[PDB]
Amino acid sequence: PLSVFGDRSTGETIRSQNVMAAASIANIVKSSLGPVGLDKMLVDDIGDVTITNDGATILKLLEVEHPAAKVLCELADLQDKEVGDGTTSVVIIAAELLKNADELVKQKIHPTSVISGYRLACKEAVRYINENLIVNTDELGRDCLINAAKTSMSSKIIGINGDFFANMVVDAVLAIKYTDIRGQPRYPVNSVNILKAHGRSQMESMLISGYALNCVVGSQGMPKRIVNAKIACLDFSLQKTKMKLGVQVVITDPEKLDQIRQRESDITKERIQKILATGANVILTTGGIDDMCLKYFVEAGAMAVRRVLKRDLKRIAKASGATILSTLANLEGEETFEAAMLGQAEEVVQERICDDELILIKNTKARTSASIILRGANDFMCDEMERSLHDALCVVKRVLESKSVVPGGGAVEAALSIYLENYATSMGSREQLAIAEFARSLLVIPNTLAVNAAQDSTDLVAKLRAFHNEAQVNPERKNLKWIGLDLSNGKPRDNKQAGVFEPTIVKVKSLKFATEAAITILRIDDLIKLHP
Amino acid sequence: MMPTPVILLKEGTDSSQGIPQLVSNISACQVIAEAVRTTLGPRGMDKLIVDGRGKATISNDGATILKLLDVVHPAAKTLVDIAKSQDAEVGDGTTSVTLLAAEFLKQVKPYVEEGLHPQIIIRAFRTATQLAVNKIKEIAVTVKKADKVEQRKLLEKCAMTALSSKLISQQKAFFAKMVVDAVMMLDDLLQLKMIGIKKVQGGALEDSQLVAGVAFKKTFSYAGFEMQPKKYHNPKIALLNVELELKAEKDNAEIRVHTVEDYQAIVDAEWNILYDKLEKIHHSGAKVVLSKLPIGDVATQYFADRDMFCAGRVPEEDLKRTMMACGGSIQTSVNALSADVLGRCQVFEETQIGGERYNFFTGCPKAKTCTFILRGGAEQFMEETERSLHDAIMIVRRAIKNDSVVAGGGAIEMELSKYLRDYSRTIPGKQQLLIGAYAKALEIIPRQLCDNAGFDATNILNKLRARHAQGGTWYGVDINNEDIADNFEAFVWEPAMVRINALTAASEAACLIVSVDETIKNPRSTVD
Amino acid sequence: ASMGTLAFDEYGRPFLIIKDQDRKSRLMGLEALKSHIMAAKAVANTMRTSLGPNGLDKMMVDKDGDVTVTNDGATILSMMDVDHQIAKLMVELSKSQDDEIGDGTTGVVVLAGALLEEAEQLLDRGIHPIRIADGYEQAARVAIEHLDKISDSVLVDIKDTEPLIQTAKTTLGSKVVNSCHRQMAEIAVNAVLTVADMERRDVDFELIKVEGKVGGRLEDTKLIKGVIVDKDFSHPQMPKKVEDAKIAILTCPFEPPKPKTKHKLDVTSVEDYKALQKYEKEKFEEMIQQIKETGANLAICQWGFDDEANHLLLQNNLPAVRWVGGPEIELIAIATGGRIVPRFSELTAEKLGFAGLVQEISFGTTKDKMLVIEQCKNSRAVTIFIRGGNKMIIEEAKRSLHDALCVIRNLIRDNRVVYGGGAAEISCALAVSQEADKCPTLEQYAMRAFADALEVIPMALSENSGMNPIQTMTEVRARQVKEMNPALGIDCLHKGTNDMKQQHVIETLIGKKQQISLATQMVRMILKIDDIRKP
Amino acid sequence: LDNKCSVYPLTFDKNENMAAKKKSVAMHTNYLSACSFTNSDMQILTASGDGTCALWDVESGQLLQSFHGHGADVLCLDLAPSETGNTFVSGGCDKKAMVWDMRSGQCVQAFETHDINSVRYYPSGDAFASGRLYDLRAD
Amino acid sequence: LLQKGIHPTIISESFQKALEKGIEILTDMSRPVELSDRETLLNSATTSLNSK
């Protein structure tokens, strides 16, 4: 009848198939949630090994061919990009929402009603979080940032070492603070260079009070330590001058050939001398330097670095007050380099880190920068440490930008579930059921946390729900909103007192994104798959 | 893992353990239940299954559908087995057992995913099932009058309820009356072999008849059979197990003669043996001769000459039914053919039924057997008619054993669910969740009824729950009016043992499925 | 939507439930019903061109290349090589109609196709198929009651065969033997009336032998009040014609007797050998003399015999025929009024049959000889000898005569008739439509669809005759409503009148009732199926 | 290669123990579909690819009767119950099984309801295996 | 219609007549609207988006 060259699935079949795909994706990463979560080891069929706990990384490395599972994978990626934390939680929440919504649909509830109920429940959950479950960081201080970083680094390879790593993260984040127009303090994370080098234990990871370059000096004749550095940042190669494509040398009188050939290098010699005459000590260029200019720098006792990465050069110039110079050409048509275009630093060295060397620009002036050198046991450990450190940096950035945090350890989900279960009775007749199922789906996070610890999930979650119900019913027992899960003892605990914090934006964005994904998938009721 | 130079088990062994395999088992049970989901209720639909040979089986019976499905999943086979068990012990409710077991497993799947110990779930199922069975026995309606009219009406109503889901539901009153008559005239053991089921192609469903006696197809008549009269008004029937034809006296017999007179004497002696058997049969006064063994052409012509009727190679079951109806005895020897061992019927007649000839024995006053002759337009039509009639017959037999009925249409299960929820609201709370899940699972049957009928299941379920909460034990789904009604007053009756066995089997299946934690599958041997 | 389910579990580990589940197929829900309706519609539309006097034959070729040109619906569907299960259901429906009635095997298929076609558009509007089946059953009950109401009774006496002849002619009108139409109807009526139990009892078709032989002309087909045997006189010098023959039917081969039990006769001396030889000769002479003593003029045996018996039979002016089949022995015994004798010693005069003429018949340049026994006193057995110009028309004539015999048998069972030509269907549709108005609205759609489906037979007759279907059917229905005359049908033969009563188009009421009943039941059964699980 | 049987018992090397009289007619050549020996060793029935059953006499060596009438070649044939004038069946590729009688040389009976290749008479003789079962007394 | 025995040209012309009549009916059912009314525009846009 249709005569379409492909396969078709319609009705309960396609809905159940989509639910199965989403559930499989959720089950892939469900075991890496919470402090008692465990990492995974991915082998990339050519021997490459990736050991990670981050949900986004696991979902990107996996190759998936079911489009709903692809939707969840891109959901995790979006949560990573926009927030940086909660990548596993959003996937799990979306999958549970899809499961419960599909159960409602199988109960002959129209999917439009389920979608409307989910939208209302998400709006009310965000409103309730913003109105009741937020804690201002003004009355906490640096301890709040430390606790947020420690909570973020739980369930990571650096979790036990939080007492040290949280201090490192907070110092690094505060060291790059800059205020823009409108007086808004913004923290440009990803300006903190993360360098990985195996060797000593994690305790020997260093926080550079400056910038760290994964580069060395181009010539062994140059000094490897300069005290009062005058950094000159350039964006052009220092090589023998070659004329452009449109210029061709034609010789009729041979007497000029030697002059031509000599000028070919004298041009670059003059440029080097002009740069050096201003007292420059360190020269960084994104382009290459040939042996001639390297010797020019050697004779002057000046450090010269070639093939510097553009982002590293930009960060160094911004921190040290230097200016990138793609060319030496002023507005008078001449070719000059003035000393005002030079950055400064208190020391530039080339240190040795486990049989290799890297350049440290210590204590730059006119702006403070930061870099972190992570020391591990092997490459995989250092990579996972870098991923966890990035998660912590993003969490600290979110906390410092928006000064609201919410209690962790499943407290928010339990409070939201109780509130939404109560609130659904005042809305609609079938969207009532949809909101109730949204509330029930929100409880998957504490259940997974308890299960990962091999604890009594049913009783522990029941006690959490009882505590939050008492908090929401008795007006004078509102201090129980902070009661979450203490996985070490398997007992409810005041997580706000215990210092288990996390940014509000994580929960808000995760809820919004999960609702979007569940609505998108739940809308499908027919699939046509054309043969390739 | 590692190669382990010498491996422990044989290569190719598949192992699966933990929560994931239990979840997979539950999912497989759901898949099996989906195969018979739409066959339940007066609005249920049949399923067509084609085997490898190409033969198609069309059925509404859950047990038949599950048997025709070639299930190889170890956990899913439990539902097929419990369907067979319900069919064997009760005869009806083979869809309800599978739906209930799958719903139990589905309801407890979320708790299994949280790591709840399976022993707790098993204990909760056992407690809930014991309570439900006790409640069914307690509230089942029985009448202690032993009134013939009331008993007949109860049997008819139970048969109609058991029949109002099959393709013969249009003639459910007709077939219920037939089934009740047949079972009542069965004597004391209600043996199913004493109810003949003959399928004849052609004719309407209403053309089907129940014979107050025995009827069987014509069996390969010899020459001279058409000269025998085909109607008698008070025949005496000789039920024999005898080969009435010229043949070797015995397999190892061997005749040795050396004289032509002895040769002729031997020939005449064989002829005289046959004629002596025939004369002994004839002088008994019988007019109809039935044998389990072949009756030759010589005997056929001999009986035709005497205005007698003969039919050899009668199937053994048909002779047993003829013996139980006419009231004679099967004789392997004709030396003593007295009046005691001769059957008697009011009228014997051979008539044409749709291109086939049948022999009819009617007017038996003390017959302990029947013969259903079913008409229809196709082989599968008669097959499904026979299956439906078998369901009705088993229900009527069980109701004969005990007249303990419960209103159907989901009313009994809604009452059980209300009772179980009330009980669960008064216990500590670990078992409360599981017993509540059991009570909620008991709602699958009315929900499936509404879904099959095209209703809105949620509204009907809410109305039923409210009605049962505020009083009224026998309120169930009214399919025709798309509402709820007192199904006891609507004569939607079910023997209580049907629901009792359904709950018992479903609970046992769920407990067995939940109890398994590891599945080990050995490699195939002699794959060929 | 196809092949069933495929998940392989949410944990990645294998999830296999049914053996070879990846090689099987599954259709569910409404699209399964649509596929079944489409297949049944295809079968019915194929069959509907062979409906009525202007129907066209279908040329069926089997796996061996043999050709069967036929118009019978049951035969066409039986020889049709179908793989769809619903097509097999259609074939079984035709076989059921053939077995129960013998006529109308094409009308049932067209009616079922029309019913399913209407049910398709009913399903497209969101009506549960069980509701459609219930409405169809209600309308079928109404139509059957109306047929009983408008039925007419005919006399089935042997002194006036005109209504029977008319019914047989109506049955035969659609077949190729309509050239010999009246003769065919006459012989069918006489055959059925000759062999039948008059108290409205059964008609034993085993007493009607239908025999065909090529050559001659189709008009040469005749009814013989005796038996036509495919044998001939054993000795070539025996006379070819015996008149007033006293017939001796025997089942004992004309050979020396042989015990059934394992026997050995010992010859131990020359005297024993001489005695054995004399015993052989005397047994031959004695059996022949015993046959002769009864006064018989002709002997029929079943198991053949040897040279000495042959020459003894010839020498004593005793014509004989050997190797006559068992059924033929029974037919000869029934027709001639003689018993079957198992051995010579039991042969007496009173067991002899009588035949007014026994003759050997040649068939042109073919060397084949066939025996004829006829002119019996009160023969209770008949034989229809069919001639023709090729085997194919012979087979078609055989099945057409079978249809006529079945129709007269049905008249014997019940003598109520309804005028055909689509008049019965139109009146039933009118009655169903009238009863649908009083019906509550929900089943009204099913009843109206049933009436529209019933309207297909006159439309098929109209289009097969070249007339415009809708206009002719509408005008005939309007005439039926205007004047009380349920006998107005389609003038397929263009006789100039729409009244089937003057045209003598007569159909048995049992046939129409069976048609409607079987079509409704099969349609309900197909409507109840919502799942297919072919491998 | 294909034969691997050219050295078959054709040699029949013995000490001349009265069994050397194997006859081995093989005059008609073609294909010897069924060389069944009659219960009375006087006669041999042979069937060829032309579809004609042939009866030979071992002593004279002459073709008694050629039985023709089969639609296709006769793949298989049997013998009478004991002798009974050798009323033998003949099953061939034409889906038909028929009985012949040399006392008349005609097809006495015929059956067509099935190629038949495994005919075998019942010990009584009233029937015969049709590898089905056809009854002589009822055709 | 075709199965009833109507040429597929009477059907086309009859469908054209029905289309013309239906255009007349729809035009009769219509209501004037001016772009100055924002409520009608918003209602139309919402009705368009109701199914997405």
Ligand SMILES: Nc1ncnc2c1ncn2[C@@H]1O[C@H](COP(=O)(O)OP(=O)(O)O)[C@@H](O)[C@H]1O
């Ligand atoms: N010390 C702690 N005690 C209890 N719960 C915690 C603790 N630290 C984190 N959690 C909770 O564990 C959950 C899982 O976090 P995790 O999965 O590691 O982050 P992500 O979702 O970004 O991978 C978070 O929702 C958080 O609330």
Ligand SMILES: Nc1ncnc2c1ncn2[C@@H]1O[C@H](COP(=O)(O)OP(=O)(O)O)[C@@H](O)[C@H]1O
């Ligand atoms: N007239 C009726 N009205 C409502 N429900 C009915 C009616 N008759 C039977 N049922 C329901 O059908 C269910 C069983 O379906 P059915 O297919 O007949 O038997 P099975 O359980 O063997 O599949 C019973 O639970 C009964 O409640």
Ligand SMILES: Nc1ncnc2c1ncn2[C@@H]1O[C@H](COP(=O)(O)OP(=O)(O)O)[C@@H](O)[C@H]1O
């Ligand atoms: N002379 C005739 N005039 C009008 N209609 C006829 C005539 N003869 C037969 N018919 C109709 O033709 C239809 C088809 O009959 P036929 O083809 O013989 O057998 P079947 O009913 O099996 O198709 C019958 O319903 C009958 O009413």
Ligand SMILES: [Mg+2]
């Ligand atoms: Mg995290």
Ligand SMILES: [Mg+2]
């Ligand atoms: Mg039932």
Ligand SMILES: [Mg+2]
């Ligand atoms: Mg006809």
